[PDB]
Amino acid sequence: MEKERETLQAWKERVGQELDRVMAFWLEHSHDREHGGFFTCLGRDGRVYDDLKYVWLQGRQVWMYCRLYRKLERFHRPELLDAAKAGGEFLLRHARVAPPEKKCAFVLTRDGRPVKVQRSIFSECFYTMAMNELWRVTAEARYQSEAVDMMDQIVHWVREDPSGLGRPQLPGAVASESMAVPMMLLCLVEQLGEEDEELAGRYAQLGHWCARRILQHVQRDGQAVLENVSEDGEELSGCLGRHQNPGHALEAGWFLLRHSSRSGDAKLRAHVIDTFLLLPFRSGWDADHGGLFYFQDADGLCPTQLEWAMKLWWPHSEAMIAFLMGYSESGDPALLRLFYQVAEYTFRQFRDPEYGEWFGYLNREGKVALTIKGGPFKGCFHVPRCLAMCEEMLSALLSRLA
Amino acid sequence: MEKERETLQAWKERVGQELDRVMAFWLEHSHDREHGGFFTCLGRDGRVYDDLKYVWLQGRQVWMYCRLYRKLERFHRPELLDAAKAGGEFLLRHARVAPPEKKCAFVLTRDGRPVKVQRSIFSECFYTMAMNELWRVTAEARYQSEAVDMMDQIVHWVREDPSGLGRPQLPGAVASESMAVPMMLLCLVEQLGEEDEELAGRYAQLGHWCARRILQHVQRDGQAVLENVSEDGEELSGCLGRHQNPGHALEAGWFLLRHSSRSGDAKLRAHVIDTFLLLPFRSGWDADHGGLFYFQDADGLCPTQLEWAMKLWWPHSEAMIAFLMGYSESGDPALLRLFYQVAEYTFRQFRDPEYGEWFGYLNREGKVALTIKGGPFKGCFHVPRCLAMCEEMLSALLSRLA
Numbered sequence: 016m017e018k019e020r021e022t023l024q025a026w027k028e029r030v031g032q033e034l035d036r037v038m039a040f041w042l043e044h045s046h047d048r049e050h051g052g053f054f055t056c057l058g059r060d061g062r063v064y065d066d067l068k069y070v071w072l073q074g075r076q077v078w079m080y081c082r083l084y085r086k087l088e089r090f091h092r093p094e095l096l097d098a099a100k101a102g103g104e105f106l107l108r109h110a111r112v113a114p115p116e117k118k119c120a121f122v123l124t125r126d127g128r129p130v131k132v133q134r135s136i137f138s139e140c141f142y143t144m145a146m147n148e149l150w151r152v153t154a155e156a157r158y159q160s161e162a163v164d165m166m167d168q169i170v171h172w173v174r175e176d177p178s179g180l181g182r183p184q185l186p187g188a189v190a191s192e193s194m195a196v197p198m199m200l201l202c203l204v205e206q207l208g209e210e211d212e213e214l215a216g217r218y219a220q221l222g223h224w225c226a227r228r229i230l231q232h233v234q235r236d237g238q239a240v241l242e243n244v245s246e247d248g249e250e251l252s253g254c255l256g257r258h259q260n261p262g263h264a265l266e267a268g269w270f271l272l273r274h275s276s277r278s279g280d281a282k283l284r285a286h287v288i289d290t291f292l293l294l295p296f297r298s299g300w301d302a303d304h305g306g307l308f309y310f311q312d313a314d315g316l317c318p319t320q321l322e323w324a325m326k327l328w329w330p331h332s333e334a335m336i337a338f339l340m341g342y343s344e345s346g347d348p349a350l351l352r353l354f355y356q357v358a359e360y361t362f363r364q365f366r367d368p369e370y371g372e373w374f375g376y377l378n379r380e381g382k383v384a385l386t387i388k389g390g391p392f393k394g395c396f397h398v399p400r401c402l403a404m405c406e407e408m409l410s411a412l413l414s415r416l417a
Numbered sequence: 418m419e420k421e422r423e424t425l426q427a428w429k430e431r432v433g434q435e436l437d438r439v440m441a442f443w444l445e446h447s448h449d450r451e452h453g454g455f456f457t458c459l460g461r462d463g464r465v466y467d468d469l470k471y472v473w474l475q476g477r478q479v480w481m482y483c484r485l486y487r488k489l490e491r492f493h494r495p496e497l498l499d500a501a502k503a504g505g506e507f508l509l510r511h512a513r514v515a516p517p518e519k520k521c522a523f524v525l526t527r528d529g530r531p532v533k534v535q536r537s538i539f540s541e542c543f544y545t546m547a548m549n550e551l552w553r554v555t556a557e558a559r560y561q562s563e564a565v566d567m568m569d570q571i572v573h574w575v576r577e578d579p580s581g582l583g584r585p586q587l588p589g590a591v592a593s594e595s596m597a598v599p600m601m602l603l604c605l606v607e608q609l610g611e612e613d614e615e616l617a618g619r620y621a622q623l624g625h626w627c628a629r630r631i632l633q634h635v636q637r638d639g640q641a642v643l644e645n646v647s648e649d650g651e652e653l654s655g656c657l658g659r660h661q662n663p664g665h666a667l668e669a670g671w672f673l674l675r676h677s678s679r680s681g682d683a684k685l686r687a688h689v690i691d692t693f694l695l696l697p698f699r700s701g702w703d704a705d706h707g708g709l710f711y712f713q714d715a716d717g718l719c720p721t722q723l724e725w726a727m728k729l730w731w732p733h734s735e736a737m738i739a740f741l742m743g744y745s746e747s748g749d750p751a752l753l754r755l756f757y758q759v760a761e762y763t764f765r766q767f768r769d770p771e772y773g774e775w776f777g778y779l780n781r782e783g784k785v786a787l788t789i790k791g792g793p794f795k796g797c798f799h800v801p802r803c804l805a806m807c808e809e810m811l812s813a814l815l816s817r818l819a
Contacts, residue, residue: 031816032816035816088812089816152612153614154614210556212556277495407490410491411490414491417434
């Protein structure tokens with residue numbers, strides 16, 4: 016129908032042009048030509064307000080650059096590959112703290128000297144993501160070895176020895192799994208298996224285990240997705256067990272959708288849309304001012320985090336992907352409508368048409384709380400990945416309406 | 418440029434949809450689910466009129482499929498993947514006649530038996546492109562080995578021992594080089610070098626050599642491109658020596674553009690444009706009925722080939738790519754206009770706006786000469802490739818002009 020088609024073409028045009036714009040911001044402001052890597056502590060105008068290198072964002076930016084370079088012809092330029100390679104080098108040299116050991120630092124000084132180390136696998140995950148993409152664009156085996164080796168390091172750490180990360184558990188701390196873990200691991204499994212039967216086959220068992228774990232966070236007879244649950248998949252008590260993050264449930268949701276799409280498993284896909292897309296959104300959406308809450312408490316109690324009611328950029332970018340994907344997958348037009356809802360709200364609320372890129376932090380009412388375009392937790396990732404994926408999905412959708 | 422970004426969007430939309438259409442044709446009619454491989458002998462309606470498998474086109478199709486699969490998201494579907502793999506397996510099992518040796522048959526029976534062997538390298542050339550592409554989408558090393566091993570064999574055949582190709586030398590035969598050899602060689606060099614720093618550097622010199630040979634076909638002080646020249650890059654006599662093909666000149670032209678795209682030589686770029694684009698078009702375009710002549714004689718003598726005046730699909734598909742790429746590399750409007758001129762003519766004359774895909778043979782008047790959509794020399798290549806590239810090229814142009 017013309018109605019549908021025109022709206023999609025419009026949106027595909029909107030996100031595509033936006034990607035060009037947000038990418039332009041990172042291309043002209045975040046490149047550290049003197050030491051390699053990127054500056055993410057960028058002000059509203061792109062001015063660097065700090066020269067620290069947050070490992071997460073470096074890995075993410077490298078992956079993003081490569082990803083675009085090989086998927087979107089308009090991004091197949093040397094500037095991207097040069098920056099991406101210079102980024103991988105930086106990671107290759109300084110990412111690791113004591114660099115036999117694979118444990119990576121959370122943040123490094125501009126020159127690559129470790130400043131902080133986080134007892135998690137997050138820096139490492141993005142490290143392996145950037146490594147694998149660099150290999151995809153240069154075919155240099157050293158990148159894939161770095162990637163696969165780190166991957167196996169992470170698997171071991173997560174499934175066989177939490178020790179390699181530190182923080183021996185106190186007899187009082189409850190053994191709880193954070194959703195981010197299976198999600199990230201699953202993300203990796205998907206990243207590596209992409210166009211690689213060997214790797215896809217190698218981590219098949221892990222991919223399943225990961226999806227299964229993520230599903231274990233669906234609690235209260237399928238009425239709540241809980242950020243944390245016991246290692247055995249049971250609801251925890253206290254603020255810890257009641258903690259919710261809608262933005263995260265949606266992201267896990269689309270990660271799961273991606274995992275099952277190939278599995279032509281409409282059963283799983285259905286359940287995921289219900290419990291990971293609609294439920295979180297319905298609970299998370301702020302009826303009074305629009306936008307998804309950052310945090311929530313399953314029992315409806317006031318969250319403990321000061322910033323729970325803030326509207327952050329990534330839960331929305333992830334909502335856009337998850338809905339467009341769910342629709343692309345089930346054709347259920349309700350999801351298309353939700354995508355439109357989320358997409359209009361975030362495009363209207365987070366974009367900064369003055370300088371480029373998007374603000375990442377708004378107060379509950381949707382007003383800009385922080386003017387920074389990048390920082391300790393915001394880089395060239397969530398936004399550009401969301402725009403790229405939507406652009407792709409739309410392109411594919413308008414190909415069946417034509 | 419609003420006055421221009423319009424037709425461009427128009428064309429990008431037209432080529433993308435057309436590509437969807439032509440691809441749909443091949444996907445639904447060409448697959449051989451019994452012995453693998455594709456049927457290229459299809460009538461105007463997709464009906465098979467012969468089950469012979471022409472190695473050239475078999476390799477071209479497996480190449481096309483994979484290329485689309487990984488570069489255009491909407492084609493990133495199982496159908497294309499499984500089909501290309503079956504095509505590749507088919508090629509792996511029968512392309513080679515004496516399957517110790519590397520010589521590939523020219524035509525095989527539906528089940529893979531050699532029917533005829535062309536004393537050339539073309540079959541092997543496309544086998545190479547198909548295997549390399551199969552590597553890029555499965556990461557299966559066996560495919561890459563097959564590719565590189567063949568590439569090396571081909572190089573030997575044209576640079577060291579052409580005798581392996583067979584074809585006895587005769588005292589009256591003049592030693593000559595046909596532009597198609599350095600052309601196919603350069604095409605393979607660009608192909609293998611894609612996102613592969615190793616192979617890129619490894620064949621870098623050969624790349625430079627081919628380009629040089631090709632350029633050696635420009636004669637009469639840049640006033641003519643000759644299909645055949647002596648090994649010494651000198652004009653031969655007779656019909657052979659004056660033989661021209663505006664389609665290959667234009668093809669060579671963009672091959673060179675892509676190649677020297679890294680170099681950046683504006684002097685060479687201007688040259689290739691002038692002699693491989695404007696020249697072949699200026700003298701090969703049918704003023705009376707529009708369209709590029711198939712063959713022409715450098716001396717303006719009536720060709721000896723019966724079909725010399727026939728308007729074929731691939732000279733035009735190659736012209737669209739060339740002009741568009743030239744405008745992209747030089748920004749000269751004169752070239753953009755020529756793209757429109759060619760694009761308009763080929764879309765209007767070759768498209769079969771009832772069954773899909775294009776007719777490949779029209780009489781000089783532009784009327785359909787043959788109604789086949791595929792045959793001994795027409796497969797899933799020149800059209801989908803031309804469309805896909807123009808799409809990508811228009812996307813990049815629109816993004817920087819917007």
